[PDB]
Design a protein around this ligand. Structure first.
Ligand SMILES: Nc1ncnc2c1ncn2[C@@H]1O[C@H](COP(=O)(O)OP(=O)(O)O)[C@@H](O)[C@H]1O
Lengths: 62, 62
């Protein structure tokens, strides 16, 4: 309850979402790769963190 | 590029039933039409269910 109520909620999956977004931030992202990355991030978020398809999505994102 | 998408849209408009396009070429994941049993975390239904939901009608022009 301390972890969630404090305001850190939704911080889950940030290591695979926020860190990569920052990694792309310094890069001048073209539109094509930008939209591809957005789609891949959405697929990663939808998929469970502990499945093989999620691992493949994470590998492609990296 | 013979306006197949555009002509399909025009016939959908003329026939008065709601329009919706669907790309299947190159697809391999049959789950995109079947989704998953919903036991998986974040599982989503087949794309046809989404099409019906978005179209809001039971007789669209797929
Ligand atoms: N007579 C026409 N009137 C309006 N649009 C047309 C016409 N002929 C071709 N087009 C355009 O050509 C595009 C082609 O899509 P389509 O022929 O379905 O497949 P492709 O992806 O091979 O082009 C459409 O966006 C459409 O607007």
């Amino acid at each position: 309850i301390i972890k969630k109520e404090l305001g850190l909620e939704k911080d889950d999956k940030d290591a695979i979402e926020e860190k990569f977004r920052e990694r792309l931030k310094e890069l001048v992202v073209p539109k094509h790769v930008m939209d591809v990355v957005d789609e891949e991030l959405s697929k990663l978020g939808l998929l469970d963190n502990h499945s093989s398809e999620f691992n493949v999505t994470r590998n492609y994102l990296d | 590029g013979v306006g197949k998408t555009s002509i399909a849209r025009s016939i959908a408009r003329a026939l008065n039933r709601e329009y919706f396009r669907f790309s299947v070429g190159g697809m391999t994941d049959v789950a995109e039409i079947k989704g998953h049993r919903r036991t998986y975390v974040g599982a989503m239904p087949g794309k046809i269910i989404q099409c019906l939901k978005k179209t809001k009608t039971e007789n669209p022009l797929i």
